[PDB]
């Protein structure tokens, strides 16, 4: 019956592919062909924060559009004031192998993880002054690659042992566990209403989970290599992935298929980060070629570059009001564009 | 009115960060690799995600990193150890896959100028086995006498023939685990590597 079940799975995959392809009557580029282009958009460096000493692996924006948190492999995590370049906090870590960081929406907690398979929570509003460790979650057998807050009580983490879990910072116990991927899960993104999230595994696929039920709903397979970044459209109806095949793609949740592909002949290096614009017209991507290419999301064409980095770009982000964009790199430098 | 105090606090924490970095710049880092049950435990004990061991020998603060617990693809986390001073390799004579691991490690993109220290252990067991069984089973192509010294030289030459970059050197020493001379070998190799790196940095090399 094993061969029969394999044949049934193959025929189900064929049916799914036929159904997905039967709904593609037209193309996005055809419909957005009669729209004036955005033109040239050159951005100039305004500020430059230089506090770290090693490669920067993650960054995040506060909900106030003023405070930012940076995590570097020197064993430290700082909190920046972007309007003044002043430093507010400096938290020493226990394990120097850090690969992720997060900022609570309320502004009271931060999170950190890495090669130690343990995710930490820090309290920033202590009565006695300094910052103390509030929790230490440990349930993963593989390196943790991403962690994103839901509220002040719960957090969702993605690990390298092909599993995703939803925790509870009050007790430190796994409420739910998501399984099904084949390789390492290296990316995560949460919906605007924080009821759904997507992840990108290393077996060249991406799935759409849901927090309440702990199940999977759809899978999008259209890439050629591993997936290292993911982000959500501001309307929460689409998400754009960035792989190591030097191509970024746009997937539609309702259409259950890809819509447009952003690539060019010259680009060879893979993509390490991806981010959208607040109104959804631009799409900035970070490249291993030390540059950042600003794309016109509705026309699949370039609109400018962001030069000024001496090494690979590791992280990029846009504020909540869309007034600024910040990038980090392996040379221990962060720049604020405008 | 009160932003000057915030500026003072920022300057103070920046100074503390600089002092911490200056203090931490002095350490020497060594990566530790090898196959499963290859005797790495014997060497680390002779003096869950990752295990770190530190000890001091002649005013030098070593740090050994063990990554044997990471049962994942090595291409996803190998860039974190790009700045290691050297790589220690252990090989069990009394036993193919080690050749593939050595080939993969030596020709990595991030390790094009990193020296490798090779340790050959279980020499006594290899001698007893060669007194009992020949060396032609493990190497069907090897031709010549069935002596211990010739077999050891052939194995070392086979291991060394996997390096192509002229800018890196491989140090080889034969161990029997009934000794405490590993620290001196590591010290000498590290001193030579440090001298070479210092000379290359200044521009006379």
């Amino acid at each position: 019956e094993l061969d029969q079940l394999r044949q049934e799975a193959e025929q189900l995959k064929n049916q799914i592919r036929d159904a997905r392809k039967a709904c593609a009557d037209a193309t996005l580029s055809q419909i957005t062909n009669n729209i004036d282009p955005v033109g040239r958009i050159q951005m100039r460096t305004r500020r430059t924060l230089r506090g770290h000493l090693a490669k920067i692996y993650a960054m995040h924006w506060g909900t106030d559009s003023r405070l930012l948190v940076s995590a570097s492999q020197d064993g430290k995590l700082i909190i920046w004031d972007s309007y003044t370049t002043n430093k507010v906090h400096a938290i020493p870590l226990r394990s120097s192998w850090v690969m992720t960081c997060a900022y609570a929406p309320s502004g009271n907690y931060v999170a950190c993880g890495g090669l130690d398979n343990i995710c930490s929570i820090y309290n920033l509003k202590t009565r006695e002054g300094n910052v103390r460790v509030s929790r230490e979650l440990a349930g993963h057998t593989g390196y943790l690659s991403c962690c994103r807050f839901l509220d002040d009580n719960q957090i969702v983490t993605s690990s390298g042992d092909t599993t995703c879990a939803l925790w509870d910072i009050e007790t430190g116990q796994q409420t739910t566990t998501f399984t099904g991927h084949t390789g390492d899960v290296m990316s995560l993104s949460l919906a605007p209403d924080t009821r759904l999230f997507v992840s990108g595994a290393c077996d060249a696929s991406a799935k759409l989970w849901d927090v309440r039920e702990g199940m999977c709903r759809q899978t999008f397979t259209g890439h050629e290599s591993d997936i290292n970044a993911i982000c959500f459209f501001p309307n929460g109806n689409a998400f754009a992935t960035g792989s190591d095949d030097a191509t970024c793609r746009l997937f539609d949740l309702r259409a259950d298929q890809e819509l447009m592909t952003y690539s060019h002949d010259n680009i060879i290096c893979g993509i390490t980060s991806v981010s959208f614009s607040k109104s959804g017209r631009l799409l900035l991507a970070g490249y291993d070629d030390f540059n950042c290419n600003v794309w016109d999301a509705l026309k699949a064409d370039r609109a400018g570059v962001l030069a000024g980095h001496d090494n690979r770009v590791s992280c990029l982000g846009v504020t909540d009001d869309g007034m600024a964009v910040a990038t980090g790199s392996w040379d221990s430098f962060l720049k604020i564009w405008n | 009115a009160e932003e000057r105090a915030a500026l003072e606090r920022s300057k103070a924490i920046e100074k503390n960060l600089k002092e911490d970095g200056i203090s931490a710049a002095k350490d020497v880092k060594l990566l530790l690799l090898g196959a499963d049950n290859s005797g790495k435990s014997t060497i680390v004990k002779q003096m869950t995600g990752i295990v770190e061991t530190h000890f001091t020998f002649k005013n030098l603060h070593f740090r050994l990193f063990d990554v044997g617990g990471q049962r994942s693809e090595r291409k996803k986390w190998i860039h974190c150890f790009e700045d290691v001073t050297a790589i220690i390799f252990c090989v069990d004579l009394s036993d193919h896959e080690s050749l593939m691991l050595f080939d993969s490690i030596c020709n990595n993109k991030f390790f094009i100028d990193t020296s490798i220290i090779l340790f050959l252990n279980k020499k006594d067991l290899f001698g007893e086995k060669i007194k009992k069984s020949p060396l032609t089973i493990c190497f069907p192509e090897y031709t010549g006498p069935n002596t211990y010294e010739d077999a050891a030289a052939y194995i070392q030459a086979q291991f060394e023939s996997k390096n192509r970059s002229p800018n890196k050197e491989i140090y080889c020493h034969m161990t029997c685990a009934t000794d405490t001379n590993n620290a001196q070998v590591i010290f000498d190799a590290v001193t030579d590597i440090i001298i070479a790196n210092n000379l290359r940095g200044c521009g006379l090399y």
Partner: single-chain antibody, 226 residues
Framework: DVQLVESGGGLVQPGGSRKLSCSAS????????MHWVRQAPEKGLEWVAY????????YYADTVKGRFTISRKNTLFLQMTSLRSEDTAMYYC??????????????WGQGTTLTVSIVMTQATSSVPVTPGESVSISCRSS???????????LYWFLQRPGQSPQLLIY???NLASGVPDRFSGSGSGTAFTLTISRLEAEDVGVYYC?????????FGAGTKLE
Amino acid sequence: DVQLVESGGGLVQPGGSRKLSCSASGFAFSSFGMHWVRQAPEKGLEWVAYISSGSGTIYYADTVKGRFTISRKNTLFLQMTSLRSEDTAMYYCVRSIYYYGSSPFDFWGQGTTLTVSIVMTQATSSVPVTPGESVSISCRSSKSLLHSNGNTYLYWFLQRPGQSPQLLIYRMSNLASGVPDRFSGSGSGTAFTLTISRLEAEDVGVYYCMQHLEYPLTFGAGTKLE
């Protein structure tokens, strides 16, 4: 539990000297700034001295410069010399931390009774009030309290009878930690007011208002809601 104990006061003849101490525990003493606030037995509060975090910067009042000295183990000192008859007042120990989003003047001390042998105006000095009603107190300022960055510095304190003052509203709009939701504050430039909703028997005392723009810190006369 955060504690700040001070002692060392007593009867002194004129022309003498005395040493005051402020022992602190329960918090990171090395990352805070310390103040000194006195209150005459029949008058309002008055600023005395300030020492920054790390002894970097020190400030003194107008009528104590050259005669007092502030130093900071986990203990703070205050050396006073040439004690005249106008220094008879209890001295409090006040902590404050300064960074983006901090709340200075958080926790006050207990005070030591020492016995010796911008013009910010609060027009109203006494109001008649009964439980269950709503009361409001207002105090003005001689100079505008809005800086270029958009921040206004008005603080409101409450001193229950026989107790120490506790911070209620900082920067004219922000409610402190632990304060009930009844209190609220508003103002514009030079005229400020505070509102109390559903007054009970646990909110009876005297109120003070204070600025934090010019470091010669100045309080108000004070209003007693009896």
